[PDB]
């Protein structure tokens, strides 16, 4: 029972109806991710091969990060005037780093499981999934506290620098994405084939996830001032990118991953 208006039965959404057309997608993402997480947790009971049991925690954290992305996209439309100002610049980076570091963990597991070596343990894959996200949670919990306590708050910064800081904060997850892309591109020289479909899954996912980023960040930095699309196409395009990245993660990665790690 939450709308996107001025205040208390006031003028409705302008420019575009980027309200329920993202809220319903977020709700569907939450429901499907809950069901998928339940199925993936029940998957631990029936799996007998320990070669792929190692990546199960990394996929679990990817599912948790995608659930966080959907839940943030739920709280990414009310604009920067409530107490939801801190979350939009901390949780976004944290969950993006979590997801792309899980991708990097899976890529490293493929590298060390395709060229004759042995897959890392649960501890090692979990540690490498969270370690690349440690720098981002540090950077985000630094930015958010430094602004909401020391400097001038979020709700009094100009929009010309209120979304440039988004790029400034996400340069690290951009580097994480670039590292994942380079690793899964370098996976090409590999004799074993039973894990190469996972590598091509990572390659397709990161190519799509660098294409969604090569425009949207560039759009907010360049075109919205020229297209007169700010700050009205400022937040809705970010929520659109968030929800479609969450959906491409849940659909073009987790469904095919569950297809090649099927239930028998």
């Amino acid at each position: 029972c939450i709308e996107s208006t001025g205040d208390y039965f006031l003028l409705c959404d302008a420019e575009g109806p980027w309200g329920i057309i993202l809220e319903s997608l977020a709700i569907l993402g939450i429901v499907v991710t809950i069901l998928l997480l339940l199925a993936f947790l029940f998957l631990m009971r029936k799996i007998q091969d320990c070669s792929q049991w190692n990546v199960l925690p990394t996929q679990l954290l990817f599912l948790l990060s995608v659930l966080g992305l959907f839940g943030l996209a739920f709280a990414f439309i009310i604009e920067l005037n409530q107490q939801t100002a801190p979350v939009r610049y901390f949780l976004f980076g944290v969950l993006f780093a979590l997801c792309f570091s899980c991708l990097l963990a899976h890529a490293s597991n493929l590298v060390k499981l395709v060229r004759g070596c042995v897959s890392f343990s649960w501890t090692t894959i979990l540690c490498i999934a969270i370690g690349c996200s440690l720098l981002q949670i540090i950077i985000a919990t630094e930015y958010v506290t430094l602004i909401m306590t020391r400097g001038m708050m979020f709700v009094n910064m100009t929009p010309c620098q209120l979304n440039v800081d988004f790029v400034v904060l996400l340069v690290y997850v951009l580097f994480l994405m670039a590292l994942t892309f380079f690793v899964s591109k370098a996976t090409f020289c590999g004799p074993c084939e039973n894990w190469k479909q996972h590598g091509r899954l990572i390659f397709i996912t990161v190519l799509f996830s660098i294409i969604i980023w090569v425009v949207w960040i560039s759009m907010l930095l360049r075109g919205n001032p020229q297209f007169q699309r700010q700050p009205q196409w400022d937040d809705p395009v970010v929520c659109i990118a968030l929800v479609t990245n969450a959906w491409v993660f849940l659909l073009l990665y987790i469904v095919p991953e569950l297809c090649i790690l099927y239930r028998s």
Partner: nanobody, 118 residues
């Protein structure tokens, strides 16, 4: 707690001018501003009504395309771009801030008598 408007240019019709509304003593990111134009007879008429943090650009029906509004909460100022000036648009544009739930504007400015005409 008080609102003041700016603008004193004398531009021929077909030109451009910029309006402003500088205010302080109140929480800029707590309500919605309302540009309103003053015309003799009927009185007040609606102009663009930016809200929250520059996320609701409701240009008026009779001015949609010639007036651009924005909300800058850094200096606590509200601007207005009167480009492509119309001769039959001489009026006083008052600056207000809404209460929201009843669309009441408790806070008001002093307007600006722009006299663009042929």
């Amino acid at each position: 707690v008080q609102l003041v408007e700016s603008g004193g240019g004398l531009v021929h019709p077909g030109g451009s001018l910029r309006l402003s509304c500088a205010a302080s003593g109140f929480t800029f990111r707590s309500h919605s501003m309302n540009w309103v134009r003053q015309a003799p007879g009927k009185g007040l008429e609606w102009v663009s009504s930016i809200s929250s943090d520059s996320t609701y650009t409701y240009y008026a029906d009779s001015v949609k395309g010639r007036f651009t509004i924005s909300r800058d909460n850094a200096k606590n100022s509200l601007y207005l771009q009167m480009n492509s000036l119309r001769a039959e648009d001489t009026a006083v544009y008052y600056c207000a801030r809404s209460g929201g739930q009843w669309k009441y504007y408790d806070y008001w400015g002093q307007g600006t008598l722009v006299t663009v005409s042929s």
